[PDB]
C-alpha cells in the first residue's frame, strides 16, 4: 500500500 | 504501508 | 509503516 | 517501486 | 521502494 | 526503503 | 486543503 | 491545511 | 497547519 | 476591503 | 483593510 | 490595517 | 479569504 | 485571511 | 491574518 | 509604474 | 516605481 | 523606488 | 528610456 | 536610463 | 543611470 | 558568437 | 564567444 | 571567452 | 546611443 | 553611450 | 560611457 | 537507470 | 542507478 | 548508487 | 570541442 | 576541450 | 581540458 | 572519443 | 578519451 | 583519460 491519503 | 496521511 | 501523520 | 522527480 | 528528489 | 533529497 | 507531489 | 513532497 | 518534505 | 491600490 | 498601497 | 504604504 | 501561490 | 507563497 | 513565505 | 502578484 | 508580492 | 515581499 | 525584465 | 532584472 | 539585479 | 538579453 | 545580460 | 551580467 | 554592438 | 561592445 | 568592453 | 547532462 | 552532470 | 558533478 | 550549459 | 556550467 | 562550475 | 557510456 | 562510464 | 567511472 504505497501511497494512501484520506 | 509506505506513505499514509489522514 | 514508513511515513504516517494525522 | 515508485519514483518522483523534477 | 520510494524515491523523491529535485 | 525511502530516499528524499535536493 | 492542498496536496502536492513534485 | 497544506502538504508538500518535492 | 503546514508540512514540507524536500 | 481585502486588496485595494490607487 | 488587509492590503492597501498608494 | 495589515499592510499600508504610500 | 484569498490565496495566491506558484 | 490572506496567503502568498512560492 | 497574513502569511508570506518561500 | 509596475505592480505584480505571483 | 516597482512593487512585487511573490 | 523598489518594494519586494517574498 | 529602456526596460528589460522577466 | 536602463533597467535589467529577473 | 543603470540598474542590474536579481 | 552568441548574445542574449532577457 | 558568449555574452549574457539577465 | 565568456561574460555574464546578472 | 543606448544599445550598440559590432 | 550607455552599452557598447566590439 | 556606462558599459564598454572590447 | 537514469543519465542527465544539463 | 542515477548519474547527473549540471 | 548516485553520482553528481555540479 | 563541446559545450553544455543552462 | 569540454565545458559544463550553470 | 575540462571545466565544471556553477 | 569525447563522450561515451555503456 | 574525455568522458567514459560503464 | 580525463573522467572514467565503473
- Chain AG residues whose CB is inside 8 A of the AF6 CB are 5-6
- Chain E residues whose CB is inside 8 A of the D5 CB are 3-6
Q: Is Z3 exposed, middle or buried (0-12, 13-18, 19+ CB in 10 A)?
A: buried
Q: Cβ K1–J5 below 8 Å, yes or no?
A: no
CA dihedral angle for residue C5, residue C6, residue D1, residue D4, rounded to 10 degrees: -80
Residue with cell 558568437: V1
AC4 and AD3 in contact (C-beta within 8 Å)? yes
d(CA AA5, CA W6): 17
Declared resolution, Å: 3.5
Could you tell me which residues are beta bridge partners of residue D2? E2
Using only C-alpha atoms, chain J has a radius of gyration, in whole angstroms, of 5
By what method was this entry solved?
A: cryo-EM
d(CA S4, CA W5): 10
Could you tell me which residues are beta bridge partners of residue I2? H2
Helix or strand (DSSP H, E) at AF5: strand AF2-5
Is the four-CA dihedral L1, M1, N1, N2 of positive or negative sign? negative
DSSP states of chain Z as a string?
Answer: --EEE-
d(CA E2, CA G3): 18
Amino acid at each position: 500500500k504505497i501511497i494512501i491519503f484520506k
